[PDB]
């Protein structure tokens, strides 16, 4: 419960901060912002398409509890996955208005911040 809640809250903070950066970004600097997030923050953002396939994290350890805690903060429609279109990562969907996005985090790099 407490360790699960902690990891979820850290992942929520990362997604909210990232969404916030994109939301208030100068439109002319938006692609440059995405390069900065990826290279310097290790946070990769992508547009999310309705046809993007995903694979769930296994029901292992506290995975399902972390996912429940994430959804309670970000929304029940949030997708959380270990891969998208077969690309491995910690993937969490988010939205701005009617646009859908993914955040992808590196698993190894995330484990130092969790």
Does residue 93 interact with a second copy by CB under 8 A?
no
Among 1, 4, 24, 56, binds a second copy (CB under 8 A): 24
Does residue 62 interact with a second copy by CB under 8 A?
no
Does residue 23 interact with a second copy by CB under 8 A?
yes
Q: Which residues pair with 96 in a beta bridge?
A: 99
**Strand 99-105 versus strand 43-47 pairing type:** antiparallel
Among 4, 43, 66, 104, binds a second copy (CB under 8 A): 43
What CA–CA distance (Å, rounded) separates 38 from 46?
10
* φ and ψ at residue 25, rounded to 5 degrees: -70, 145
Instruction: Give the binding-site size for a second copy (rule: CB under 8 A).
Output: 28
Q: Which part of the chain contacts a second copy (CB under 8 A), choosing from 39-47, 56-64, 79-87, 91-99?
A: 39-47
Say how many C-beta atoms besides its own lie within 10 A of residue 16's C-beta: 13
Does residue 56 interact with a second copy by CB under 8 A?
no
How many CA atoms within 13 Å lie on the side-chain side of 89?
A: 18
Among 1, 3, 32, 70, binds a second copy (CB under 8 A): 32
């Amino acid at each position: 419960e407490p360790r699960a809640q902690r990891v979820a809250l850290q992942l929520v903070a990362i997604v909210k901060l990232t969404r916030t950066a994109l939301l208030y970004s100068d439109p002319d600097l938006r692609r440059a912002l995405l390069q900065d997030l990826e290279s310097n923050e290790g946070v990769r953002v992508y547009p999310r398409e309705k046809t993007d396939k995903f694979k769930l994290q296994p029901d292992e350890s506290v995975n399902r509890l972390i996912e429940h805690d994430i959804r309670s903060r970000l929304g029940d429609d949030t997708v959380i996955a270990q891969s998208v279109n077969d690309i491995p990562g910690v993937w969490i969907s988010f939205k701005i208005d009617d646009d859908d996005y993914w955040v992808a985090l590196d698993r190894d790099q995330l484990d130092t911040v969790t």
